Amino acid sequence: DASTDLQNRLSKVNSFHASFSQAVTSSDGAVVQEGEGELWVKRPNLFNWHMTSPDESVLISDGETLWFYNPFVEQATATWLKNATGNTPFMLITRNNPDDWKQYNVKQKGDDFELTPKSANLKQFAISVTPSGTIKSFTAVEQDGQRSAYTLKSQQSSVVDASKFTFTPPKGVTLDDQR
Amino acid sequence: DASTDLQNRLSKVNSFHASFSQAVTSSDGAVVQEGEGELWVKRPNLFNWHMTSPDESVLISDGETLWFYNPFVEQATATWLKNATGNTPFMLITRNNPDDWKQYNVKQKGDDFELTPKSLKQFAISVTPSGTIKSFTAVEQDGQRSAYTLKASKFTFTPPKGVTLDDQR
Amino acid sequence: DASTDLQNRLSKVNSFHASFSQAVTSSDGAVVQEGEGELWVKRPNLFNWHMTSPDESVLISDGETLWFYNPFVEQATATWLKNATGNTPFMLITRNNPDDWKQYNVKQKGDDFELTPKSLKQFAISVTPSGTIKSFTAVEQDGQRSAYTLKSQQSSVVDASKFTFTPPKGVTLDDQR
Helix, strand or coil: CHHHHHHHHHHCCCEEEEEEEEEEECCCCCEEEEEEEEEEEECCCEEEEEEEECCCEEEEEECCEEEEEECCCCEEEEEEHHHCCCCCHHHHHHHCCHHHHCCEEEEEECCEEEEEECCCCEEEEEEEECCCCCEEEEEEEECCCCEEEEEEEEEECCCCCHHHHCCCCCCCCEEEECC | CHHHHHHHHHHCCCEEEEEEEEEEECCCCCEEEEEEEEEEEECCCEEEEEEEECCCEEEEEECCEEEEEECCCCEEEEEEHHHCCCCCHHHHHHHCCHHHHCCEEEEEECCEEEEEECCCCEEEEEECCCCCEEEEEEECCCCCEEEEEECCHHHCCCCCCCCEEEECC | CHHHHHHHHHCCCCEEEEEEEEEEECCCCCEEEEEEEEEEEECCCEEEEEEEECCCEEEEEECCEEEEEECCCCEEEEEEHHHCCCCCHHHHHHHCCHHHHCCEEEEEECCEEEEEECCCCEEEEEECCCCCEEEEEEECCCCCEEEEEEEEEECCCCCHHHHCCCCCCCCEEEECC
């Protein structure tokens, strides 16, 4: 019931945009880092995730290649998307693949879902999503108790020009091409 | 006996306040973060731990409920204190529970105590003979180190409006 | 093959200095921290690693003792270097010890080497044929990545004073020696 319901809710909106706030907190309650950004998702296999502060970070899927880019160390990494897995709440959300969801035991409390893996450094993921499909927040907890929490705002369902899901490494950027 | 000595020292001061500095350093020596805050402890079961810089976070036990709060993402988590464990040096210190201490092999060097789990890598706590806590450190298996140095309505919490509470109770 | 080539390149420059930028990135692409500093190495067994931003941090080997120092919390830690291990890409580089390298399966693609432990997820090191180290990265099992990029590497021999450390006044020393 819980897993099927979560999947049904995520299936309702396949092209959306939203801003986010992030807080990484150790088990003792100390903040490791806080940041902000925005994200765009177009199922299937397309996304643009951009952390804008306090440091910039770029993660984009053009449908074939998954790109990671850090402007500060002037490095990018390229991999084939087909090799990627649902290893972060955001990746699970972009894929919404039944084969991924079956690897977790899912519990539901209203709009709040908790996912605990069936085998083994994660402890559990949490995703809050309304009945109509609005993603409100998501969290990843590690075995050491560290928590990575995201809250989403201004969530709008729209289809943006495909140009958002493309990336070419900027001039002067060293590409670690694992493809 | 090092465990007994540590417990004896901790049991000397059951109600206290201190300000703290914190530094989180990875095994390669890179600083992950540095911060400051203050804390109040009143055994049994009450505390207020507050990081004030550079990012605010609150951890409070009202004696029944353990609350975590992060104003930046406006989230709070409530759990029953009965279910908490001494999984951080601060928690071990607030509880000072023999049942927690017996889960560690404790070595002593003057005021410096090192604790290794029988079943993280290790915790360290420095406390004077009179029970003044000077510092405590937690080390993970990957070598990351979290080091702290130390220098009634307080034990209550009411989630502010617009805060989303994950009530695990 | 690859491990022998990596070692051969590292053996060409035993005394050098470099400036570095660092970026710690979680598996979701979120930057945990960014920083910069400089480092000096003189094999065997001597080094001075200094982070200037976001906050000061100092890691020095005077050839016998390994020192960690954080001025903000006013703490230092001393241990015997003989007990140190090649537990980070930086330490592996300072040691360039065949006995360390053997604990890893090494793959090569031009100047890019990738090391996977036989018994941490992976380490990666880039070094030119002439011995110029360009970058190194560590990846944990949780997918968090610590990436260092090296700039202005100079093969030089600085004064021996760079490889010494005395705890400043008022710093508490955790002497594990």
